[PDB]
Amino acid sequence: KEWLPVTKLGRLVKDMKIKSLEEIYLFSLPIKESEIIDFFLGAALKDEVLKIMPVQKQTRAGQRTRFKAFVAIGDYNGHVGLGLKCSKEVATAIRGAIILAKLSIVPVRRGYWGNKIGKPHTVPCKVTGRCGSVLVRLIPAPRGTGIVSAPVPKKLLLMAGIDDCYTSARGCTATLGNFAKATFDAISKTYSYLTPDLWKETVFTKSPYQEFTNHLMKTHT
Amino acid sequence: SGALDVLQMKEEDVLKFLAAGTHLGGTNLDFQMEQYIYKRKSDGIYIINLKRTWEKLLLAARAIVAIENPADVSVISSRNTGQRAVLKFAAATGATPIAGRFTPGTFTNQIQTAFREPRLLVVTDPQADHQPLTEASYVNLPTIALCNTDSPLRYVDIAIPCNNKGAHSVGLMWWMLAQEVLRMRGTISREHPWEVMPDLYFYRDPEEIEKEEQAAA
Amino acid sequence: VRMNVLADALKSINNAEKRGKRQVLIRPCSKVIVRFLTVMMKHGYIGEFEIIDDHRAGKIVVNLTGRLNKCGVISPRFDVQLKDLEKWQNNLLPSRQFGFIVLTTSAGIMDHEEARRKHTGGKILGFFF
Amino acid sequence: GKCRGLRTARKLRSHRRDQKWHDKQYKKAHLGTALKANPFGGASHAKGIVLEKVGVEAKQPNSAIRKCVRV
Amino acid sequence: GRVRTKTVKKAARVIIEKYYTRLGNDFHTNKRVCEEIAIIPSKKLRNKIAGYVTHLMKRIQRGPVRGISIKLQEEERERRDNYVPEVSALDQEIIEVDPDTKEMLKLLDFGSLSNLQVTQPTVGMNFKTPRG
Amino acid sequence: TKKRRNNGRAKKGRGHVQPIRCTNCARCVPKDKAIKKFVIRNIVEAAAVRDISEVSVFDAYVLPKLYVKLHYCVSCAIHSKVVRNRSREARKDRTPPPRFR
Amino acid sequence: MQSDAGEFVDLYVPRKCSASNRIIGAKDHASIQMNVAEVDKVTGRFNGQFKTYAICGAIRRMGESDDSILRLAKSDGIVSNNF
RNA sequence: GGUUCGAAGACGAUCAGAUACCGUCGUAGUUCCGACCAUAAACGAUGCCGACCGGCGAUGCGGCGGCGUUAUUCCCAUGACCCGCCGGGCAGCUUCCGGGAAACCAAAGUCUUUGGGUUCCGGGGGGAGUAUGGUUGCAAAGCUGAAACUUAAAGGAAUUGA
Ligand SMILES: [Mg+2]
Ligand SMILES: [Zn+2]
C-alpha cells in the first residue's frame, strides 16, 4: 500500500506540495503514476466496464483468443477518462483498463445555454470528436434537458459531470471502440477551445519543478 | 545578449571563430536558417553572420543560467566530434552529460535504470540527435541545438547557427557557451580571459594521439 | 472565374489563421469586404488592416490575432426576415454567447445583434466566431 | 446540394423528383406493378378456401417439414 | 563451439562493475575472488564466469569496452601513461586566415595581428558532381 | 488495389506508345513497359581467348564485341530471373543494382 | 468565465501560446515554458528575474518555435534590435 | 493491291480426351482511296473554371541577370557549358498542412467550424444492360431501358495463419 514514487511530479504530490490536479493540467505535465489520480480524486472516482471484447489471432494450430476491456472513469464533477487494456485474462484486462483510464483523465469545461445563472451545467460551445469513421458532435441544451444521446456517450457525459447536452453521431457507431473514443475526443476538446472569456492576456507563474527545485535535490537523487 | 556594451563581441572571439571556421556553412540551405546567413560564395558555401550567431549563443547561455538546479540541464552528443566537448562542458558548469548512444526511452520509459527527467536539452546536431528531440516532444522539454545551415529546426527552440561538422568549431562553440554560463553566473570575471584554453574541447582522433604519443617520445 | 470576391477573401483569412500567420494579403478588395472586416475588427477578431491602393481593385493586408476560429461566407445571399434570425444563428453560430452573423440591411452591413436592436431584416453575407 | 444559385429551384426539385425513382421502396409503392402483382391486392388479411395440404421441406442447416396448406 | 551464454557474460559485467579493485590479469586469483564475492551454485559456472572476467578486464586497459561502464574509472585508467600537453594544441606561430575571413574580420575593428597572415583566395570550382 | 503509383511503366504525358516484340516470345508489349537490357559480350568466350590470341596472324588485334539490345515482356523478365519480386517498401528503390566487377 | 453574480466559476484557466495565441491543453505534451535569464546592466551578472515564454505543440513541430522565441526576445529587449 | 503475319480451315504432334497451348500450310483480313459503324481497362479507373495552404532537387519551352570555360581568332556579337531568378508544362522526392475505412493523396486538403460557380451521374446483391416500345445502321449492332421473381449478405482496405 506504501507508494514510493518513481517520477518527480509523483514525489511533489506525495510530499503535499502540489495541492490540486489543476496545477498539473495548467503546465500539461504527462502524469505517468496512477497514484497521483487516486491521491486527489481518491474516494470520488467510479469505474464502469463499457464492454469486454474477445480478439483472436490465427497461429500454427488454432487461435489465440485474448480479451479487450473498455473502462470509463471520472468523478461526477469535472473529470473523465477512458482506458482500453488487452490481456489473455479478463481480470488482468479490467485491472489494467482502470489504471490506463485513470492516467488519461482530463478536465471537462462546462458552460451555460443562454442565461448565465447558477453553476455551469452543459457544454460551453459546439464541439466535435472524431475516431476512425465515427463522428460525435456535442451541442449545448437548456437546463434540466438531460443527456439526449446514445447509452455509450450518455454514461461518458454523465461521468464527465455534464447535466444537459444534445448529441448527433454519424458513422459506424456500432463499433463501441471508436464510439466512446469520438465522445472522449469531443469532451477533452472543451478546454482547448478559445472563447471571448479566455481572451485576457495570460500571466505566467512558476512550474512545479522550478518552484520546488530546492526540495527535489534532497528528497531523491 | 544585446543592447549592452558589456556583452558585445570583444577583441578575441572573432579571430577565434574565423580560425576555427565557424563562419563556414554547408553547400545547401534550410529555408528556416535563411535569417542567420549573410551571403553565398562562388565555391557554393554559405557564410554565417557571426553577430546573430553570437546573439543566439548569449540567448542560449541565458536559458541555461535561468535553471536553478544546474544538475538537470542534459547535454548530448552522439557524433565523435562533440563527445569530449559535452563532458568538458558538463564538468565545468554542473550539467548531466550523455556522450555517445542515447538509448530510446530514457525520458518516456520510467522503468529503465538510465531514466533521467531533465529540464533543458542541449544537442550538437539535430540530424545526429533526431532521437532525443522527438523524445523531448513527449515530455515538456525546451531544446538548444548547434544547428548547421542545412540542419532542420523541428522541435528546436534555440538554434545556434554554427559549423557543427568541424572538430575545432564544435569544441570552440561548446567552450564559448560554457564560458558565458559561468560569466553570467559570476564564477568567472567579465574582463579577464578564462584560464582554460579552448583546445581542451577538441576531438583528438586515434591517429593524431598516436602522433602525440610519438611526439612526447 | 472569380464570381464571389468575399468568399475568397474569407477563405484566405481562414487558411492564414489555421496555418498560424501574423498577417495575410487579400487581393481584390471591395466596400463589402472592408465593411465585413470593420465589423470583425469592431468586436476584435482581427487587429488593424491597411488597404493598398493601386489604380485597380485594391489589396488589403490584415493584422491577424489568434482569437478567430472560423470566418465563412453564405452564397447565395438569402433574404433573412427578422423572424428567421434565430433559426439562422441557431445552426450557423457555435453558441448563444459568442459568434456573429453579419447581414447587409438597408441601414448598412452589421451583425444579428444590431439588426435585432434597430428592428431590421436584410440578406446574410457570412459569419465569424 | 451541388448547384446553389438563388433561382435553381426547378433544377433541384426536378433532379430530386427523377432520382427518387432509383429508391427501391419509393418505386415499389408508387409504380402500380407491386400492388398489381400482390395476391392480397393491398389488403391486411384475406379469406380463401383450402384445396390441399402440402409438406414444404425447410431451407439449409435447419432440417424439418413445414405444415403449409395450399389456399 | 565455445560461445558463453547471457548468464556467464551478464554475471561477469556485474562482478567487474561492483568489484573492479580486486579482479586482475591472473585467472586463478580472481577465480578465488569470484568464488568468495559471488554465491555461484556450481564449479563449471564459476570457472566460466572467472574465465570471462579475466578477458573483459584484460581489454578494459586497451580501451573502449561498451557494455560495462565505470566511465570516469576507465577515463582514470586512460590517465596513467599520460602524454599531457606541456605546450598545448593552439600555442603556435602565424595562422592561415582566408582573405574572405579578413573582410568579415575587419567587419570588426581587427585588420591584422602578430600571428595573422593573409594567403591566397580560392581559385576554380571542382565541387559539384555531374548529374549522371 | 493500386500497386505501383506509375502503372508499371514510364508513360506520364502520352496516351499511346508504339508496342514492341519480346525477344524470347513475340508478345506485343508497350515500348516503355518492356524490361530493356544492353548486352556487350566478346565474340569469343573466356578460355577460347588464349587459343584465338596465339592462333591469329595479327600481333595485338583487339577482337570486336557483339552489342545486343534485348527487350523482354514482364513474364519472360521474371521467368529468366532478370527482375524478381521485392519487399513492399523496397519495390520503390529505382537505383540500378551495383555493377563493380 | 463568470456568471451574472461575478463568481469565477470554471475550475482553471489554460495558458495561451506566446506566439500563435492558441491555448495549451491539459494533454499537450509537446508544449514548452522557457525562462530566459535577466542580466544586470553594468556587471553582466544574473539578477534573479527572467522573461518566461509558453509555446504551443503545433508551432514546435512546424519548426517556428525558434523564430517565434527570437521575435518575443527581440520585442522584450533581450536580443539587440540590430541583431 | 497483295511482301510479311494470320480469325476461319487443312493437317502433324502431345493427351485418358484436345475440337487448345506447341509446329507446317492458310482464305477473310492486315496496306492505300471512297462510303459506313461510334464502341474499349476510350484509365489518372479521378468533369471543368477560380482562389488559398510546407520544403528540396532536377527537367522541357520562353524570358531575364552573372565569375568563368570553349567557336567564330578580331572577337563586338551570336551558338555549346557553368551559376541563379521569373512565368506556363510533364513528372519526382520529403513532412504530424490536412484528410481518409485504410491503401494512400500538396490534393483525393481548406467538411458537423458543413454554402465560390456550374454540367453529368450513384442508392444492398441478383434478375439484366435482359424483355418490350422508340430511334439510328445495308448488316453486325449502337443510344434510351423496366417488371415479375429470388436473396442476407455481395463487396472495399488492411491484419494474422495455411
Ligand atoms: Mg489509350
Ligand atoms: Zn515474352
Residue numbers in the entry:
A (entry chain D): 58 to 278
B (entry chain B): 2 to 218
C (entry chain X): 2 to 130
D (entry chain Y): 2 to 72
E (entry chain S): 2 to 133
F (entry chain b): 2 to 102
G (entry chain W): 1 to 83
The authors write:
The 5'-UTR of the (+)-ssRNA of the Dicistovirus CrPV harbors an IRES that is able to direct initiation towards ORF1 in the early phase of infection. Three domains connected by flexible linkers could be defined: an elongated domain I (DI) at the back of the 40S head contacting ribosomal proteins uS3 and RACK1, a second domain (DII) formed by a dual hairpin at the back of the 40S body interacting with eIF3, and a third, large helical domain (DIII) placed at the periphery of the 40S E-site, contacting ribosomal proteins uS7 and uS11. Interestingly and in contrast with the HCV-IRES, the conformation observed for eIF3 in the complex with 5'-UTR-IRES is very similar to that observed for eIF3 in the 48S complex, with the IRES ‘filling up’ cavities that are present between the 40S and eIF3 in this canonical complex.
Two main classes of particles containing density for 5'-UTR-IRES, 40S and eIF3 were found in the dataset. Masked classification and refinement in Relion3 revealed two major populations of particles, which differ in the degrees of 40S head swiveling. In class-1 (open conformation), the head of the 40S shows an almost canonical configuration with very little swiveling and no tilt. In this conformation, the latch of the 40S (an early defined contact between the head and the body of the 40S [Frank et al., 1995]) is closed. At the other side of the 40S head, access to the channel formed by ribosomal proteins uS7 and uS11 is exposed and eIF3d density is not well defined, probably because of a high degree of flexibility or low occupancy (left). In the open and closed classes, the positions of the 5'-UTR-IRES relative to the 40S head are very similar (right and B). The main subunits of eIF3 (a/c/e/k/l/f/m) show a similar conformation in both classes, having a similar orientation with respect to the 40S body.
